[PDB]
C-alpha cells in the first residue's frame, strides 16, 4: 500500500529520547533490523527531489510527478538546467534513521532534517483501500496517529508515488 507519514511532536524528555522510546516499543513488538533506509526529498523551484529507497531519484514536483528518472538522470538534468530555475536560495534538508521489517511490514522514523523537525513515523503494507488491518496494526503501535488522506476515489491501483506525495506534503507542512 502507501501509508502516509505523520509528524507527532513529542516532548517532555527530548526528541531523541522520544525516538529511542518509539524504537524500543517497536523492538518490543518483535521487529528485526533491516538496514538504514534513509529517505531524502529536497524541495526546489516548484520542483522537488527524492532519494527514497532504490536507485531512482524520482522528483514528484507536481501533476503527480513522473517518478521515473534514474538516480543520476534527474540530478544531471537539474545540474544542466542552470539559469532556468533561479530559486535555489531556499534550501531543503532530509531525514534519516533505521528500517525494521516485522512481517510483510516496514517502519521508517523521520528524524530532524535540518535539526528542527519531529519524529516522522512511516509504514507500509503487503498488498495494498485495505485500511482495516493497517489501522489495527497502527493502534497497537502508539496513540494519536493515522491522519490518512490517501489517493481516494481512484479505483490509482496502489499508487507507489503516493508515499512520495505524502512525504512532500509532510515536508511542506514543516
Amino acid at each position: 500500500v502507501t501509508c502516509v507519514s505523520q509528524m507527532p511532536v513529542a516532548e517532555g524528555k527530548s526528541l531523541q529520547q522520544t525516538v529511542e522510546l518509539l524504537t524500543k516499543k517497536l523492538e518490543m513488538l518483535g521487529a528485526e533490523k533491516q538496514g538504514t533506509f534513509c529517505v531524502d526529498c529536497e524541495t526546489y523551484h516548484g520542483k522537488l527531489m527524492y532519494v527514497m529507497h532504490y536507485p531512482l531519484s524520482c522528483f514528484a514536483l507536481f501533476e503527480n510527478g513522473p517518478c521515473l528518472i534514474a538516480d543520476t538522470n534527474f540530478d544531471v538534468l537539474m545540474v544542466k538546467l542552470k539559469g532556468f530555475f533561479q530559486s535555489a536560495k531556499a534550501s531543503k534538508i532530509e531525514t534519516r534513521g533505521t528500517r525494521y521489517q516485522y512481517c510483510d511490514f516496514l517502519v521508517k522514523v523521520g528524524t530532524v532534517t535540518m535539526g528542527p523537525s519531529a519524529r516522522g513515523i512511516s509504514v507500509e503494507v503487503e498488498y495494498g483501500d485495505c485500511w482495516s488491518l493497517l489501522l489495527e496494526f497502527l493502534q497497537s503501535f502508539l496513540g494519536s496517529h493515522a491522519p490518512g488522506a490517501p489517493t481516494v476515489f481512484g479505483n490509482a491501483v496502489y499508487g507507489p508515488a503516493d508515499t512520495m506525495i505524502q512525504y512532500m506534503e509532510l515536508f511542506n507542512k514543516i
Binding site: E63, N64, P66, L68, N73, V76, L77
Partner: protein, 180 residues
C-alpha cells in the same frame, strides 16, 4: 561527466542491401532486430535565449518501455578528428510522464518526427539505420540515415580512432562525417 561521439550518416534511399548485409556481416552482432519510435522535441527558454531540446523518443512498438530522453547540444570543439560531438545525459521517463512534465514545467513542442528501420550494435559503438517520415500523429525525405554513434565517459578519445577505422571499413558503401 559523460560524453558522446555521434557521427552523421546519409545513404541513398535505394542502396539498402550493400548496407544491411555489410553491417550484419562485418561486425555488429548475432540475431539483429528492428525498432519503431517517434520523437518530440521541446524548448523552454524565455530570457536565457537557449532552447534546450528534450527528445522524448517513445517506442510505439514497445511494451510500455520508458520514454528514454537525451539532451544533446553545444558541440565541443575538440579537433580530435572524431565525430565532433558533445556531452550527453540520458533520462528515463514513465508512461505519459514526459508530456505531463512538459505541460507542468511548461514546454513548447518544436516539431514531431517518427523513425523506423533496422537495428545494429557494436562493442563500444552503435550504428542504426532508419527512415524519417513527415506525417500527422495518426500516421518522408527518401533518404536513409546510418546512425553510427558512440556514448561514453570522457576518457582519452580512444574510441574516436576505432570509429574512424570502422567507418573506413564501410567506405565502399557510405562515407560518414561530422555535421554543423
Amino acid at each position: 561527466n559523460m560524453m558522446e561521439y555521434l557521427l552523421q550518416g546519409s545513404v541513398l534511399d535505394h542502396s539498402l542491401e550493400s548496407l544491411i548485409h555489410r553491417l550484419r556481416g562485418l561486425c555488429d552482432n548475432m540475431e539483429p532486430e528492428t525498432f519503431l519510435d517517434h520523437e518530440m522535441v521541446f524548448l523552454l527558454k524565455g530570457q536565457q535565449a537557449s532552447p534546450f531540446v528534450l527528445r522524448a523518443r517513445r517506442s510505439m512498438d514497445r511494451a510500455g518501455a520508458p520514454w528514454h530522453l537525451r539532451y544533446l547540444g553545444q558541440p565541443e570543439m575538440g579537433d580530435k578528428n572524431r565525430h565532433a560531438l558533445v556531452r550527453n545525459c540520458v533520462d528515463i521517463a514513465t508512461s505519459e510522464n514526459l508530456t505531463d512534465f512538459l505541460m507542468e514545467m511548461g514546454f513548447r513542442m518544436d516539431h514531431e518526427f517518427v523513425a523506423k528501420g533496422h537495428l545494429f550494435r557494436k562493442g563500444i559503438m552503435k550504428v542504426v539505420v532508419y527512415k524519417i517520415f513527415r506525417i500527422l500523429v495518426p500516421g518522408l525525405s527518401l533518404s536513409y540515415l546510418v546512425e553510427l554513434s558512440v556514448v561514453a565517459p570522457a576518457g582519452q578519445d580512444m574510441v574516436s580512432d576505432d570509429m574512424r577505422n570502422f567507418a573506413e571499413q564501410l567506405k565502399p558503401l557510405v562515407h560518414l562525417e561530422k555535421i554543423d
